[PDB]
């Protein structure tokens, strides 16, 4: 029951001929599965971790200028030179300065003036990469057995460390069976080019070419003891005031500039090893061996009592906590809902089949009633506990919310959203292929466009579609305008 | 600032976004607009740091 009240869950009910269902585990969002004859169990991502970090392009963020030296040559007899300039430890650039009888020349004329300074490393900022092999994924598995206090519990569950070596794993649940996990870490994220840019006590996710494009001097990135920098002219400026001398300044500390720069980067944790959060992984669930506990259990007949208050969570599901009062340890709980005093029995018991394992402390049921005002009974007889409920909303509202949720899923998850909750249907695969090619062509156009610019481009193209002449107007307008507007509305999040 | 100085147009010296204070050097400056420098990040739901 780790999934209750998370604000991001999504029901994925369904199976296939050989009983697999695939699902993308968005980090920080847990998916819940259902079946006619299988237990409803909850899956949540946790702690995509890495090891054996490889470092390259160790940057520099603050300089230190020492050993200021300068050399001048008389006008019109060649450029000034310094034997010290060749060494890579020196930054040096020559301007022109007028040279006169007042500063010891032969004749009045412009002359070269090299000035060199000893750039020194200070507070380097390293950016490491990850060997793709070292990526490690952990998936927690919680089944919906109601315990005394297992509501949204996070430590409870069974970990399954899934690495690209062990793409397939078992999951030995207590007295339920083995849940199969087929995975595909290759398409989790393009980790072939991510860089883990570690700050003082922070670390981030960046794109490779952007990282190579940070306008700061860079080092070899190896474990050397005396790094040699390149493009050292960036962190040092030369002040040539009205052409009389040359002084050198170190241009301060670019820390805040960096913190402002990474305005779209995600976050990880750096504590010994780094547990990189913020990633999605698809997993083809295998429901081969799951079997319900207490299928042959006897349905007990006695009165029930409502220990805790009924309280409904977001997006339509309610929690019932009830303790059995009787003598049947193997009891299974009866359930039926009658709205309008009819026999409709409409709705779904979201939990598989609740059973009272032990009498003393309640086992808590979860169920999803229909939209209309519907009563819910539990036991049997006159004293059978009956609970009224009134869910607010209509079916069209649920449809609209589901559509919006699916759109948000598609925009963030790219081309894998069609793999989400699939069965293997021929229609679904073709839709995924078409959306994949179209979206790849689309994002090829907008690699690097921002919030407001995407909104404005969408407005411009929806206008050019609206007033155009030939039948391309509808294709351009609908497709590009709607896609760009809906991406501008929900991005950077 | 530090060992360096500059001349900037006055109208531009209040519109650059940073915290600012009365400049009374009373050892306990109560900074106006402290929100601009410090930044809150909220992870996926849950806590806040």
């Amino acid at each position, epitope marked *: 029951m780790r999934c209750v009240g998370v604000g991001n869950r999504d029901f994925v009910e369904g199976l296939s001929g050989a009983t697999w269902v695939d699902v993308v585990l968005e980090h920080g969002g847990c998916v819940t599965t259902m079946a006619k004859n299988k237990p409803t169990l909850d899956i949540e991502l946790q702690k995509t971790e890495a090891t054996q970090l490889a470092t390259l392009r160790k940057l520099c963020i603050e300089g230190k*200028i020492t050993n200021i030296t300068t050399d001048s040559r008389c006008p019109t007899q060649g450029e000034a030179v310094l034997p010290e300039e060749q060494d890579q430890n020196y930054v040096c650039k020559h301007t022109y300065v007028d040279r006169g009888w007042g500063n010891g020349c032969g004749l009045f004329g412009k002359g070269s003036l090299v000035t060199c300074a*000893k750039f*020194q490393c*200070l*507070e380097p900022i390293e950016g490491k990469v990850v060997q793709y092999e070292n990526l490690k994924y952990t998936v927690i598995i919680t089944v919906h057995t109601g315990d005394q206090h297992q509501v949204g519990n996070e430590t409870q569950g069974v970990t399954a460390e899934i690495t690209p070596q062990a793409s397939t794993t078992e999951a030995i649940l207590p007295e339920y069976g083995t849940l199969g996990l087929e995975c595909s870490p290759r398409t989790g994220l393009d980790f072939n080019e991510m860089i883990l840019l570690t700050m*003082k006590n922070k670390a981030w996710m960046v794109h490779r070419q952007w990282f190579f494009d940070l306008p700061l001097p860079w080092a070899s990135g190896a474990t050397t003891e*005396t790094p040699t920098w390149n493009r050292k002219e960036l962190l040092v400026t030369f002040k040539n005031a009205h052409a009389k001398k040359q002084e050198v300044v*170190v241009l301060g500390s670019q820390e805040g500039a960096m913190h402002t720069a990474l305005t779209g980067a995600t976050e990880i944790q750096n504590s010994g090893g780094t547990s990189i959060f913020a990633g999605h992984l698809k997993c083809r669930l295998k429901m081969d061996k799951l079997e319900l506990k207490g299928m042959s259990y006897a349905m007990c007949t006695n009165t029930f009592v409502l220990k805790k208050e009924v309280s409904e969570t977001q997006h339509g599901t309610i929690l019932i906590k009830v303790e059995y009062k009787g003598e049947d340890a193997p009891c299974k709980i009866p359930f039926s809902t009658e709205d309008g005093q009819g026999k409709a029995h409409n709705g779904r018991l979201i939990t598989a089949n609740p059973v009272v394992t032990k009498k003393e402390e309640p086992v808590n049921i979860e169920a999803e009633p229909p939209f209309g005002e519907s009563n819910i009974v539990i036991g049997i007889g006159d004293n059978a506990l009956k609970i009224n409920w009134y869910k607010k909303g209509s079916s069209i509202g649920k449809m609209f919310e589901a559509t919006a949720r699916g759109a948000r899923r598609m925009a963030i998850l790219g081309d894998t959203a069609w793999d989400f909750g699939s069965v293997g249907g021929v229609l679904n695969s073709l839709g995924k292929m078409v959306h994949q090619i179209f979206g790849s062509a689309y994002t090829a156009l907008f690699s690097g466009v921002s919030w407001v610019m995407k909104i404005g481009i969408g407005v411009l193209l929806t206008w050019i579609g609206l007033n155009s002449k030939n039948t391309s107007m509808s294709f351009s307008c609908i497709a590009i305008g709607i896609i760009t507007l809906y991406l501008g509305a929900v991005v950077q999040a | 600032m530090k060992n360096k100085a500059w001349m900037v147009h006055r109208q531009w010296f209040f519109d650059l976004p940073l915290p600012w204070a009365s400049g009374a050097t009373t050892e306990t400056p109560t900074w106006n607009r402290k929100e601009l420098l410090v930044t809150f990040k909220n992870a996926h739901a849950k806590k806040q740091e």
Partner: antibody
Amino acid sequence: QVQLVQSGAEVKKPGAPVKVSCEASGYTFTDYFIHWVRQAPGQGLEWMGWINPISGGTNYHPRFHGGVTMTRDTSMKVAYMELKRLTSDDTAVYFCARGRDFRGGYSQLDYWGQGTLVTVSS
Amino acid sequence: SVLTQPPSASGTPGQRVTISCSGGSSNIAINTVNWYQQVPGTAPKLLMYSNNQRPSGVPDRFSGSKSGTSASLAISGLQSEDEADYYCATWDDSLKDVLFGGGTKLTVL
């Protein structure tokens, strides 16, 4: 409490590298500085360079870049300094001190160790 | 620039003697000065962990501040146990290094 053992004094010959270990426990070592100030007999003491344990590089005094090196480890909370070249000049006791990262606190050397001593001779 | 402080003598009767520290326009005129006294032969301790703030040094008799390019320290009721070398150290911001002084041989009679 917070202190720096600074191991024990050792003396060597010219032309070889010597090491001075310097461990400070009792507090979170990451945030604070290590300064490595040298002190000659009957002379004033001059500071050379910081080392930030978490991410810091060497920032030696202009007299001493390319003359000394500084390393550290975060797991054991110890800062290492070694002398890549021993001339006849460096005949003194080398220190450690905790420094703050405040602009007014770059010279804030609140805590000091015993002082590992090294001299060079034939 | 670079800081230079003079060595001087004093006597065990209580008297105000000023250990003046002189610097420049980039090292001490803008930054917090730090005052150290060392018992000879061992590790120097810190006497003033701010411009005019003492962490745990002998209170009410060790107090000083800085004026423009000069920083100073004042000691009152100086006895023999205060035999120490006094150091003023300031952070140079142009050269990105702290600037320790030569040292004062403060001898008290």
